[model samples]
Every structure is written in C-alpha cells, then in structure tokens.
Target chain A: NMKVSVYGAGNQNLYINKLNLPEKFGGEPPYGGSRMAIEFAEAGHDVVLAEPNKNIMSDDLWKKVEDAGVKVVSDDVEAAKHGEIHVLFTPFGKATFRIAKTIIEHVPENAVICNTCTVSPVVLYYSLEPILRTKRKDVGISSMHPAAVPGTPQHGHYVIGGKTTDGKELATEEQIKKAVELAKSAGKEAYVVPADVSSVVADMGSLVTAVALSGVLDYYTVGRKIINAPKKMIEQQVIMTLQTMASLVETSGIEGMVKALNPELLIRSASSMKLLDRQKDLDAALEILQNLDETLKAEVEKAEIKPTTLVAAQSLVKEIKTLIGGAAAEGAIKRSARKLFEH
Target chain B: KVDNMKVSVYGAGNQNLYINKLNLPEKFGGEPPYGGSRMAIEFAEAGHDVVLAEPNKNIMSDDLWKKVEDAGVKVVSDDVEAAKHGEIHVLFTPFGKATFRIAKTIIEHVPENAVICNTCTVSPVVLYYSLEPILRTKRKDVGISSMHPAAVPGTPQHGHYVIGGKTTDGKELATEEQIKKAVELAKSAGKEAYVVPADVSSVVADMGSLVTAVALSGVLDYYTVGRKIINAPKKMIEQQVIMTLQTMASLVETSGIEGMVKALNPELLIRSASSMKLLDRQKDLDAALEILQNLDETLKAEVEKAEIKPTTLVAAQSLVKEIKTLIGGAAAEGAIKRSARKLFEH
Candidate 1:
C-alpha cells in the first residue's frame, strides 16, 4: 500500500453548520479532509491526516475516522514526513500555500504535492516553483480535486491536472498515474484535464461551466440547422456574449453583470429564440429570470455597471505577451491568474 | 404625425434569404420583405419621409418594390442621394466589411447632427470607431446609435427596436436627444423602444440572441441551485460564474471553436456537469448533457483535428482597466481602442 498524507481535516463548520450537507446534499457529517483520509485508509493505503485542531469534528466523527485505520496527527511536519503523496485538502487562500511550503522540505523524495479545491495546481506549482526547480527537482505538483464533497453520492470523480494547455507537464507521468490509481482505488473516476482548465471544469464554477455550455450547444444547433446563420456569425456571437458578460463581472461583479444584461429584456428577447424546438431549458430559464427574487432585483437595479473596456480576453493576453515579452509578461499573466484564483 | 423625420435606409433587405433560405414564413411566422425594406415600409406607413437606397433591384421582386413605393417611401439607387436627404441614416447594409465602408462613404454627405444607426450587421461602438477620426474632426455633430429591430422586421415577433444609448462603461455614443429621436422613430412606427447600453446592444439583439438566451438560462439555473440546493455563498457562486465564462471565452478567442470543444472535452464536461443537476427544474442541464453526449459526427471529427492553442486565463475587462492605469495616456488609449474595434468590428 502507498503512503498518503492529507492536510486540513476539512472544514466541518462549512459542511455541517453552514451548508447542512446531510440534509441538502445527502452526505453525512465529518466530511472534507477527514473523510478523504477515511476513504484512502479504507482503500488499504497507509494514510496520515494532518489536522492541528482536533476539535474541528465531533468525538463520534473522530472515532469514525480512527476506525477507518487513519493515523491522525496534530503537527503537519509529522504527517509530511510519512507519505509519498501529499494531498492539500487545506483551507482557501494563503494557508494552503503556507502548509505546502512548510511540508515540501520534509516530504519523502519524489513526493507529489496535490491541490484540492482550495488552490489550483497551477498556482501551487507557481508558489513552489523555486524549490521544485532546484532543491527538490524530484518533487512534482498535481491535483486530486474531488469535484464534489467527499462522502457524498455526487463525489464519484477526482479531476487531476496533468499537462497544461501550453503542453508543460506539472507532474511526472508516474506521479500523475499514481494520482489516477489512487482515485481508482477508492472507486472514483479520475479525469486528467489540462492543468490550467481543471479549476474551470471542476470547481464550483462547474455549475456555470455546465449551464453555459448547454446554451452554446443549443445555439450552435439552431444557428446551423434552423436559422442557417453562417458558422462564423454563430461563433462571433458566442464570443461576444460570453466576453461581454465576463468583462462586466470582472469590472463590476455579478450585480453589475445582471444589471447590464437586464434580465427583464433578456426574458423578452430570449422568448423569440424559442422557435421550432422543445427548448425546455429556455422555458425554465424564462420562468427563473421572469421571477427573480425581489432582493436580487433590487440589488441589480441599484448596481452600477462601471466603465468597462471591452477587449477580447485571449487576444489581450496575446497582445500583452507580445508587448512586454519574457518574464515581465509572465508576471502580468500571473497577477491576473492570482486575481482569479485568490479572490 | 407631428414629428416627421427623414430616414434613409440602406439595402432592400434580402427577401430571398428570409423567405426561401430560412423559410421564415413557415418556421418563424414572418412574411417576405422582412429586413431593411420592412423597416423602411413601417416608417413610411408611420408618415415619416423614408428613402430606401437599394442598388440591387433583385433583392425583392417588382411586386414587393411596388408595395414599398405604394407606402410612400422613395426608392433610390444612389446611397449618397439618400444620405444627403435624411436626418437619421439607418445602415441595413450587408454584413461584414461592407457596412463600415458604406457608413464611411456617407458620413461626409449626411446633414449636421445626423445620427448614424447600425442594425444587427454591426455594433454601434464599432461603427463609432470606424468613423471616429472623422467624427472627432470633420463631422463631430454626428452621433452613433442603433435602430436594431432585435427581430426580423416583418416577423410577428418584431414589436420593438433596441436603441443604443450610454454604455455600461459610461461611454455616451449619442446624446439624449439623438437616442430619443431613434426611440421616437420606433414608437411612431408602432414598435416599442428599448435603449440598452451601446456596447451591449449586439449581445441582446444580434443573431446570437439564441446564445444569450441559452446562456442566461444556464446562469439562472446555476444561481437557483447554488443558493437553494448547494447553499453556497452568493459571492462564491458569482466568482465561479465569472471564472467559467471568462475561461470559455478566452479559450475560444485563443483557439477556434473546434479547438475549444476539444479542450473542454464533451465527455468530461458531461460528467462534471452531471454533479450540478441539483434542482428538478434544471432542464437546461439535462438538455446540455444530451447535446454534449451526442455531438454530431462532423463536429466530432472537426474537434478531433483542431489544434488547441496556448491560452492564459485572465479577467479581460479587468486586465484592460489595469493596463490603462499602468501605461496611461494616448499610447494605452490607442491600444484599447484598436482592441475594442477588433472585438466589435466584423
């Protein structure tokens, strides 16, 4: 059995107190990092769960984790020394990076650092690039993103970040394969997505990702077969709509986006699109938009859609890279990435 | 009746494409003469002095042309002749580079304080940029706005005109009087008028109306599910929405649609999206799943061959704003204007 170290015993308050996942999502308490440890231990791996605060979960839940053969430790360094696979089930923001820094020096040779939902694997690699490039060149970075909460029925897959969109491999092939094996061992599907795009497809954003994708496909079908619009026009519209919404949100947040889009007008305009198809999606969408909650409507009405410079995002990325060149351009790209991930 | 505006409409509207190619009469319940010609006809019937400039007599048959003339609309072959006559120049010109070229050609001839309006063919912001040099110097009085039908002009669904006013970014392409004039023109023709932000007019009114409708539905579905079912914080939900949309759009911009489809990987998207089907009413998700699962074979083949480009995911509008602060002055403004032109100008 492979040795595994999981940081952060997950936030019980978030799972049990705030979300009430047991009732809403049909998952038991003692979820998150501790739950992942339980699963890994039950799968016959030698598992160490590094959580300093023992009071995060109830006594009964702790007993369940212990019963699953997990070796619980209060100090991160002790857990860091015990495993070849380090799973960061840590909290959001700097704490995950802090723990990753503290543990990297102590972990066994060839140990792979894996990020969960809290941090993107790309950012994690960037954070620890100096050490990974020099002192611990053997160490690899990857992700073991449980696309859904652990111990939940929806938690059937782990989205792992392999090669990036630019074809740079964050982790060795062996390290990635091990992540896939670990996921499979626990009876979950493992998806090795491009490193940069993993967060988009796997994080909570997947909700938007899924929904928006549906809209695009629907438009594509109708634009081609029904309206007979040129393919170029269809793609342009998709880019325009998505880029506009995204830019509005980037400048003025969701309230501003909602205000600018004007759901009332959207409902009216979209009604015309319900041509020659079942479009159950459109029907449901109309009902939702038409009946927006009063508080949300008020917020949208009051929100200011600030002065937004509308430029194609990817095109701008290319422009910046060409204008700045080398590390300076990389710095700008990284700062933007940090804005996306950190916030 | 009281405010009889002289409006010049370009292009006779491609009736053949509307009636025959799209079979709009049977499908969308719209009659022939649906495009620019219909807009001109409606304005003429509203007692406005409307001049329709069409170089191609065959865009519609003689019978349709007779109907337009009978409505008291003057039909002209020369755009400059029409441009010299009207207070509002409405571009129903053909799509692509032609509309911008036509606008440039007519700007010198149109009367002072005249408004140049775009239909679905181009964005008002792009139109403004194309004519910016002259508007800033020679023709500063001309305003840019839209008289977009938002639906085929002769379609039963066409009841409103989407006018371009102040943008969300606070760029006023047209004064209140210019915007109100367009509104009055629409109302006089018995159509409702909507003055949306100038930059956003194309998103809500263009052929991509289908995409906007579908995407909005998805956003609403996710918002409902995120709050009611998942119990996630509103901020958390909004961030995800931005990230997903920004990522997808950037992917498409860097890579073609085929490459984007391949990178997103329909099979993988189906699996991840399946987890989000929390509410009973997310029919959009259900439909999306079916569509992704059974992609057309030709599309699948195209995706297989498409090359995914290197994309850096950044908040585009935010980046532009940041760059403006970083670089500042005419240099930055030039870059910004050029990029904006590239996005909006077809």
Candidate 2:
C-alpha cells in the first residue's frame, strides 16, 4: 500500500453544525479531510494526517481518526517526510498554499503532491513553479480530489486531475497511475480529467457552468446546422453573452438583470431560436417562460435595471496581466480566487 | 448618390409612450415621431417614394403629420395602399399577431420581387416560416428579409439598419438583388446597413441580446474549461452547453428569472465558476466575481424569499429525439406546431 499524507482534519463546524451532514447526508461529525484519512488508513495505506490544530474536531472525532489507525502529527514537515502521496484537504486560501510550499521540500523523491477541493492543481503547480523548475524536478503536482465529501455516501469516486487539456504534463505517467491506484485501493472509481478544467466540472459553480454551457451549445447548433452562421461569430456571441451575464450580475442583482433582459421580451425572441427540427431545450424553455409565477412577476416588474457597462472581460484581463505584471496583478488574482473558491 | 427606391413604413411608432412616457427627446436625444414615422421621414428626405401606413391617427400629434407631409411622405390609412406602393416593405409594427396579420395581408398585394422586412416586432426567420406557403408557391420570386433598426429610429443611436442576408445554413431568405434594394435604401437614407444571417437576426439585434450575451459567457467558459481542462471532445462539451442554456431558458420561462437564480445559487456559482478562470487573466471571470460579491443586500434578501417553483430539468436534446421517436410522423409535427405558434400567436 502507498504511504499517504492527508492534511487538515475536516472542518467539523461547517459539516456537523452548518451543513448538518449527520442528518442531511447521513455522515458523522468528522467528514471532510479527516474522513479521507480514515478511509485511506482503513484501506491498509500507511496514512499520516498533518493537522496543526488539535481542536478542528472534538477529542471524540480525533479518536475516530486514530481508531482507524491513522498516524496523526502536529508538525507538517514531520508528516511531509512520511508519505508517498501528499493529499491536501486543507482549507481554501493561502493556508493551503503555505502548507503545500512547506511540504514540497521535505517530501520523498518522486512523491506526488495532490490537492483536494481546497486548491486547484494548476494553481498548486503555478504556486510551486519556482522550486519544481529547479531543485524539485522529481516532485509532480496532481489532484486526488474527492469531488464529494469523503464520509458521505455520495463519495463514490475520485476526480484525479491528469495533464493539461492542452497536453502539458503536470505529473509523470507513473505518478498519475499512483493516484489512480491509491483511489482504487480505497474502493473508489478514479476519473482523470484535465487539470485546467477539472475545477469547472468539479467546483461549486458547476451549477452556473452546466446551465450557461447549455445555451452556448444550443446556439452552436443554431449557428452551424440551422442558421449556418460561422464558428467565429458563434464564439463571439458566446463570449458576449456570458460576459454580459457576468457583468449584469456584477452591477445589478438578479432582479435588475431580469428587468434589463426582460424575460417577457426574451421568451418571444428566443422562441425564434426554436428553428431546428428537435430543439428540446427550446421546448422546455417555452413551457417554463410561459407560466411564470404571478407574485414573482409583480416583483420583477418593480425591479429597477441599474445602468450597466459592458466590455470584453477577457480582453481587459489580458490588459492587466500583461501590463501590470507584479504585485498589482497577483493581488487582484488572489482576491478573485478567494471570491470563488473560498467562503 | 444611392439609387432612388420605393419604401413603405407601417405603424408610426407609439409616440404616446415614446414621448409622454419615455421622454425620448429629453432622455435619448430625439425630438418626436421616434419610430416608424421617423423612418418614413428619413426615407422621404432621401428623395425615395415613401408611403407610411398607420391606422392610428392619435399615435402622433397633428404637427408631426404635417412634418411627414412636408418631407413628402404619402401617409396612408390603409395597409394595402402602402403594400402596393413599395418594392421594400418595412413593418415597424407591434409585437406578435398584428405584425403577422399585416404581413399576411400585404403579401397578397405587393408587386412581384417585392421583399417584406420586419423590424423589431418579429424574427425574419419566423416571418419567413410564417409566410412560407405563399412565398414558396405564388411569390417564388419574392424574398423574406429584415430592415430592423435595432435602436429607435428618431434617436441619435439609430445609425444603422440591420438587413437580413442569406442564412448561414445556405437558405437565401431574400435574393441578393432584393437584399441590395433594402441595403441601398438604408444607405440612400444616410444610414449604415449590416446584413446578418436571417435566423440569428432576432437574437443578436432584438432584445434577446441579454440572453445572448449572458448565455454566451457561460458557453465560452465551459468550452475553454471542457476542452482544455476536461480534455473532453468538443462535441461532448456542446451537449452540456445546450442542456444548460435550454434549462436556464426553460426555468426563466416557467419560474421567472428569480427561480432560476435561486436554483443556481450565485453564492455557490461564483465559487465554482471562479476557478473556471482556467485561462490566465480572465477579465470576465474577474468581472463576474466582483459582480456577485457586491450584490445589493436588498436584492439578495428578496431572492432568498423568492419561492422555488416546480421545474422539471431534463436533457433537452435527448428528449427531442425521444419525443420524435415516441410519436413519430404527424403527432411530432403537431408538437412542433404548438411550439412555433406560441412565439407568434400569443
């Protein structure tokens, strides 16, 4: 069995108190990182959980981590030196980065450092680039993301991030295979998605991703198969539409957004998009828009569409990163990163 | 100078609303007759033989009618009179059935090779499909197109007329010569002319731009993340995109926009979509995060209180295939007919 390092015992407060997983999801108090540690230990891997805080969970929950035969340690470097794979179930923020940075130097040769939901593997790699490019070439970056909470019944698979979709290798084949093998050892299915996009499907905003992507795809069918519009124009429209939604939501709340977009007007216009022989999306949409809730309709009618300014988001992002490359750019990136991944 | 053309503008825009309510002169920098009437005046000034059809005499003041007569536009009270006059027919009419009814009446009377164009009231594709039976048989030489002024005609923003050209799918809704007549008329009136594909003219040029722009960003994010990050095939990404947008649209249609947002949970959405900042310096992603965080507290509480209505989320494309297969033939066409009818009829 591979030696595994699990960082940060699960946040019991967020789980036991806030989410009420014991009642809602049928899992016990210590559910996140510590649970992964417990599973790994039970699977016969020599797992060491490196959590600095003793009170992240109660003494009773800590007993469960120990009862499962996990080796617990307060020192990160001490735990980092012990495992073949470092699985960070650490909280989202600079803490995750700091732990990852601290452990990278001490980990055994060829041991892959894996991130859980706490940080993106790409960002992890980006954070560790200075050392990985020089002294730690043997150290590989990857993810052993339990897409769902570890102790929950929904935790049936591990979303392992392997290579960039653009074909850049963040980890060697053997290292990726180790993550896969480790997952199987714990009796979970291993799904290796590209590192860059793993967050899109796996992250919290997948609700938005799934919904928005649908419109884009529908438009593509219209643009190509029906309307015969060019791919460039289609992509341009996609960019414009998404950027607009993001901007509208940014400046105006959902009420304002609805007012500005005017669902009453939208239903009529989008109805024409029901051109293809079988636009089931349009069918479902037409049914939904036609029967809006009256009370909600009254509220929408009162919403004031505040003035909104629209611009190309990517174009502006390019301007800041290229021109203001130092602290200014990085600081903005961190703030944005915190907004989505952190609470 | 552009060639002189015959132009018909139906429905002198609702000035009671545009002037008394919207205050277009004070707010948007236009004096009066801000819609179809303004379009006729511009055409008349350009020395075209212009006829404006408006049954509502009270839509504009008496002074505006005199301004139209001064510009030499023949203001007619009947649809057929204007229908017989112009080689290019512009329906600056109301949204929905009235536009369709007017088109239906005029097509029987307009000259051979005359093109019918809808402004904001309807889609050129829907307009074309609505009158397919007539154009395909009796008026085979005739074409369906749009001379849509995306902005109100009397406003300073009304600088361009979006004309409908051949669809990207290769259907020539309007013939090249007929489309040029619309474009030449636009230029003759000192306005820029843009020819977009017929099917998408409504979505991009009409009010649907809201859904178009917002939905577009989501698609692009998925494409980038799906193709580059997920390494899934391009087609696979498309399936999700279609499902997502259709779902949102359906949700908005039924639940209203509030229910859709409640179900989406922006608090959760930003977190997940933020890392979809897979590309470097995604200004859009940056912009989105800023937008979601700074939401007005008053709006946020209102959303929490908004009821989550019953919405059956399904994979739209698969259902389409299932529906067609389950019913087959005439029954499937009947289902299609009802959907097509909702857009125009009600």
Candidate 3:
C-alpha cells in the first residue's frame, strides 16, 4: 500500500482540484493532490492531507479527500503523526525552510520527505540536512518535483536524490519504492533524479517565467505602437517583432542579447562609428535614441520590482538580469547607441 | 458606464500609415497570424468607450470618421482633442521624435492618474529619459513605455515592451491590474503577455540573446553539415553561411534573446564546425577582430554623443572573450586555448 501526505495552506488543496490534466491521462474534472492521495488509499495505502489555514480548505476540497477515503490532518504535526511519505507543496521563500524544519521534526526519523516547489536544490538540501541529521539515521530525505497542474495539461516528471538517510525508518528505500507505486497507481509516470541536481528544475522554472514575461511585453509594445497605425500595421509589426524576439530568446538564452545591448557595448561600438565619414546621419541618431530608450526602460522595470512579493519569480528575474550584466549590459548599450549616432 | 474609461489610440501620420499597410494574415508568413484590430474590436465590443486619433487626418470628413464608426470605434482627428478627452491613452508610435511629443500632448489632456503605454520598440530607459523632463513639469503623473512582445507574427527576431511609471507622484499609475489587462490585451491578439517583476525584464531580455544566437548558429551549422553530407556545392554552402549569419545577427536585440533561448535548444551550436570557426579566430581572427574593433569604435562615439565619459579599449576585448565562450564546447575551449597560447607564447 502507498502512503501519501500533503502539507500546505488549505487553499492550496484547491490547487489540486484545479489540476488540468488531459483526458488521455484519465482526466477527471478538478483533481486535487488530496484526491490523488485518496486514489492511493483506494489502492490500499494509508493517506493524510494537511492544511495550515483553517479558512482556505473549502468544504468541497475536504469532501473530495474524504470521499477518496483519505485522512485529512489540520496541521503538520497531525499529518506527521501518521504519514509515511511527506510531500511539501508550500510556497517558496524563507518560509519554505521554516516549514521543512517543522515537518521533519514530527515525522518518523526515516520517513521520505519530498519538497515539490521549485527552489534551488542546493538551497533545499542545505535547509533540510540539519533537520534530518537530528532524525533517526535510516530516514531518507529527497526532493521530488512534479510538473502536474490543475485543469490544463497532464504528465509530470519527478526528481529524487539517491544518497544519504536518517535512522528509525518511517520511510526508507522500501518507502520510496512504495511511494513510486502510489504515484503509478494514480497513473502518473514517476522517474527519479539525484537530489543534489534537483535545482535544475528551479533554473528551468525561472528561465520559463522570464521568457513568458518578455514574450508578453514585446507584443504589448508593438500593439501599442501601431495604435494609431492601421489595425493590421499594429498587429503585423507586433507579430513580427514578437515572433522574432521569442525565437531570439528561445535560441540565445537571454545572456547573449544582453551582452550585445549592454550599456557599455554601446560605448565601444560608438567609438568605432565616430570614424565613419557620414557619422551624424539620421539612421545613427535613431539607433542611438532607440538603444538608450531600451536601456532606461530596463532600469525602470528593475526598480519597480526591488521589493518582490515572490522569491521564485524574483530569483529568476535576478538571475536573468545579473547574467545579462555579467555578459555585458553596459557594453551592448554603448555599442548600439554608438552605431546609431557616432560622428 | 463604459464612458468612465475613455480609451484613445493616438499617434501621428506615420503610425496611421503603418496601420493602413498592415496585413495581419500575411504578417508572420504562416506561423500565427495576428491583428490588433481584432483585439481593439474585442475591447470596443465589450462596451468600453473607445476613440482613435490619426493626427494626420486634418479634415473631419464623414468618410474619414466612418472608418472608426464602421468598426464601432469613435474617431478624433486632433491629437490634443483625443488626449484631453480620454482617460486611457494607447500610444503605438515610433519613439524617436513623434512619441516624445505625443506623450507631452497626452499628459496635458488626460487626468493625472491616466494609464499610458508607449508601446514602441525604443528602450524603456530612453522613453523615461525623453519623457521625464516634460512629465516632471506636469506633476510627474502618467505611465510611458516602448513595450512590445515576442509572439506576434511579423516582428524582428526578438521582441520586448516597456512599462514606465512615476511612483513618487500622488497620481497612481497603472497597477499590476492594469499591466495584466494590458498583457491580456496583448495575449488576446495572439501575443503572450505577463507581468514580470520589472527589475528582471532587462536582464531577462539580455540573456535571451545568447539563446537566440546559439540556436541560430546551431540550425545554420546543422543545415550546413547536412548539405556537406549530401555533398552540396560550394556556392550553396557560401550562400547558406551568409544567410545564416544574417539570421543570427537579427537575434542581437536587447530583450528578444532571453525569450528566444527559453524556447529553443542552443547547445547544438557546439557541434557546428563552421560557426565555431566564424565566432572563433582560427580562419578569420584578423577579420573578426577588425569587425569587432569597428563595432567598438562605433560604441565609443555613441557614448560621447550621450555626453558620457569614455572607457578604455580593453572593454571591447572583454566582449570578444564572452562571445567566444557563448557557443560552448570546443568553441569555448578553443577560444580559451588560443587566447592563452597568444599571451604565454608572446
């Protein structure tokens, strides 16, 4: 029997109901992680669902878990008291470390703990290793990431760590073997990756978020530019610009473009442009203005998010910008500006 | 009532000309056809009071007005008139000279809290610099931008947009809600728009360049290799290389590259011998170095124009080091090897 447990705010359970797996994967409307837990229960394993917020878990969400014959725990302690495999699906940030500490304390020393949110694997291991050291030596702690979402697409990948454990086993290799059976029981394809390498998912999620943001903004700019132009012009320019931008980012990985457009890149290229006999041309002026406008815009946008509300999103954007600067934001900015208006 | 929100698409003749020539169907040449007309119509149909101004339209003729009416959008000929009466101003003009001027006119007519988007391709920082002086004079109260996105059909290799605002002013600018609405508007028109943490947009744009260059280099190299395997003519290979170079160059914009890399596999460039040589210095060190030097010179002069002090020539060489490593594997290793050998042997 596969034992599955969920830990987070009650509202988070609703996220499971909002899951959007396609029908080919046995799509049912609104499958919460709790219900999936219950599915494991039906397959003959004990299951526990934990909700931190009393107000968030709606009656409907709770009912689904109950209907699946899974036990619902009000907090981490209650869940840890019974759960064999602990799944942490809470939000990311400083809070992530706090929750991991709280849960590791109550679960049997050897229980299997999986942190699903996309945090740096290195960060996760650093936070959990201390807590696990205090536990019984036979317990296994790893990171498991699922690509499952509510109500849209199905199929997810799971990453696991292969080394290290605590004692007094609530979960061991046998426990993970059982958990794999439970995930398989729910019809999800489960694969394991080394725990230390789990940070790849965080990098991936961060990159994706940045890409999505850029793609969205690029169109908005084009669409607005053609506002007074023909409807088609606005649309066409935007479409053209956006497609090109998307293709560029998708291919170059963000850092290369930043280097070319770095503020300093502008300076270097501008020195060269000054040598041109026809240096003060309008094309040059326009390019200079365009490049300057872009760099300034990048600056202002950065200022806006200095006090970010979400860590994952913040870290992702920071990584993108820092890498861009590392690649030379200053140089690119100078180069393009110089090319535009030198001489 | 929809009357509470006065939406105007305001700009000069050049903008109107672009609108007139737009072909949404053929814009992207078959990937995903896009049109803002449909997006605007969707907004108008939803009962938002909308007006469009083509400042170049001097005469308020019925036929001219009918174009707006036919689409169920109100038409205003004067830029000032449209700006003064509207609560929301949607600016889609080139940012060079016209955008700066029109933004001033918009600030004059609209309320202090009015939402304004300068959706041009110019940098957001530039828009801020250009408009800051004028906007500061008028209580520092409106959003300005040069925002664009990457999903539209006919844009260049990379795309981006800017959202600028003044938080110090009592006037509340576009909230995340408004940005989201704006993004939704972009998305509804076949563009992908999201609210990115503003601080990261520039960096995101920058890294995106690497993804684009590597992917393009890979594709071109792969094609070249395939041609070689099939024993294509030398002329064909040269033609392909030129075409490939142009394609890769197109991806060199500020914000476009980050988005581009997210969607493509860039590691393939490592396998291409030809791309490696071009980016590397084996066959064309002097040539590549010369072009790089030329670009550096161009950059230095531009910095002077902007009234900034100049840095040393060493900066250009640093950029060269970066490009060499970007293609990865032997390309990066070879660049390192060559640089070390040159220095030590010397």
DockQ for each of the predicted structures, in order? Answer: 0.54, 0.06, 0.01
DockQ of candidate 1 (2 decimals) = 0.54
lDDT of 1 at A92: 64
lDDT of 2 at A211: 42
Best by TM-score: 1
lDDT for each residue of candidate 1 in A1-343, tens digit (9 for 90 to 100): 9899999898888788877779877878688889999999999999999999988888999999999999999999999999989999886646878999999999999999998884668878877877887999999999988878898787898999999887778899999998998899999989888888887778766767766776777777777776676676677678888888877777777778888888766776677677645666577667767887898889888998887765666656656666667566666666566565553
Native-referenced TM-scores of chain A, all candidate models? 0.91, 0.75, 0.54
Better candidate number, 1 or 2, judged by DockQ = 1
Error of 2 at A98 (Å): 36
Candidate 2 Cα outliers beyond 4 Å, as residue runs: A1-343, B20-23, B217-242, B274-283, B286-338
Enumerate residue pairs that collide in model 1: A307-B169
Answer with 2 or 3, whichever has the higher DockQ: 2
- Candidate 2, residues A145-207, lDDT tens digits: the string is 665677876677777888753356889999999999888888998878666545445553363
User: How would you encode candidate 3's per-residue C-alpha lDDT over A159-204 as one tens digit per residue?
Assistant: 4433321111223577567556656766566654333233222222
